[PDB]
Ligand binder design. Sequence first.
Ligand SMILES: Cc1cc2nc3c(=O)[nH]c(=O)nc-3n(C[C@H](O)[C@H](O)[C@H](O)COP(=O)(O)O)c2cc1C
Ligand SMILES: Cc1cc2nc3c(=O)[nH]c(=O)nc-3n(C[C@H](O)[C@H](O)[C@H](O)COP(=O)(O)O)c2cc1C
Lengths: 189, 189
Amino acid sequence: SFIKSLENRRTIYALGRNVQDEEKVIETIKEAVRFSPTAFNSQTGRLLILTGDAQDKLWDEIVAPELKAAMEAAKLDGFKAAFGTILFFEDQAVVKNLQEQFALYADNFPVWSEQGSGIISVNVWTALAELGLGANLQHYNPLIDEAVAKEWNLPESWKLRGQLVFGSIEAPAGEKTFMDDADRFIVAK
Amino acid sequence: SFIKSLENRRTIYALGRNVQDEEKVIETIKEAVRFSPTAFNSQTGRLLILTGDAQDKLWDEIVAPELKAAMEAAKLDGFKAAFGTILFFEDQAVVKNLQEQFALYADNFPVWSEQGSGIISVNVWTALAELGLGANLQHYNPLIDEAVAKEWNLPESWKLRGQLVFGSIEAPAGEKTFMDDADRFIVAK
Ligand SMILES: Cc1cc2nc3c(=O)[nH]c(=O)nc-3n(C[C@H](O)[C@H](O)[C@H](O)COP(=O)(O)O)c2cc1C
Ligand SMILES: Cc1cc2nc3c(=O)[nH]c(=O)nc-3n(C[C@H](O)[C@H](O)[C@H](O)COP(=O)(O)O)c2cc1C
């Protein structure tokens, strides 16, 4: 079922490169984003999908040095060891255009775009889990934004929101608790 | 498949009350939220699920008058005609607590909570579509926030984000276009 697909998506930190069909993975990522709703069908999400040498470069040559430099003012190997990283961005040029066209809702578009980023991130994450791949969601934005845009020649309007590290599952998800239903759901007739 | 479930979720404006098993609907809504990821497992989403008399009251006694009063400074019947409305909130008391506990990430929690709201909204929406029910997502916040909190005795900390109107499908979704893949996906190796 759909609910089963949701339940099967988990944060997996222990990731490897035992990925059988990279083309199918890419196809699935694209479909998960394609079929995600966005306010006014604005489709503000943008993805940079890195594998292979690009995956190694992101972690060794961008994240590690940017983090070290930022600290002066391990886990990184576990992220590198994964098959790839999907960097999720929101296109600010579209957001701004919508704000101008519908000034009535100018304040809403940034909010809906942020919601949109969450939406496409989890849809991709869950789609990957259905292929038997694990993933985890990181936030090294805004630290790495400039270096990523330069290395892969991204438009200035792409605002980095999240990095979904993915690969073969090499150890199970940890334990997870849930709130009491009574504290978050109220049903009235 | 999961991708098929995503594709099957659409905005349906023509909604009715031909709903066979309300208990199953409520169960599915809860599960879709339960199995949605949130930053640090913070589970900030809160739902008010209205059906029957409460559904009629929301639209006739709250949304319509608040909208009319706001205008002085149709579609509403189509929303009322639906089986119910799921009001999605984010708990600001939890957000604030997280900001205090992890001041390092204080700026991130509001963002992740907004993303969280998008995540649980679409997961619920898609779960409902799998039951054969349609839905559409409205934004009469912040106009109706006070009246809703008073009528259903909600905590002040619940910040309304969206209203998912749902019911039986009485007319098909409209047409929808998609961007060129080349404009939103970049793959690098
Ligand atoms: C908006 C959002 C932001 C998150 N931020 C991070 C992060 O920066 N680093 C990380 O390791 N996990 C992050 N998480 C993962 C959550 O902590 C995880 O989803 C949650 O604990 C539930 O566990 P599960 O993913 O195994 O279901 C994030 C999840 C979401 C939805
Ligand atoms: C964050 C978000 C906000 C939206 N806001 C509204 C809204 O206020 N009113 C409405 O009728 N539809 C709204 N939509 C619906 C979108 O316009 C719709 O999802 C999009 O056009 C794609 O069509 P689909 O839902 O049929 O796939 C919203 C969708 C999302 C994800």
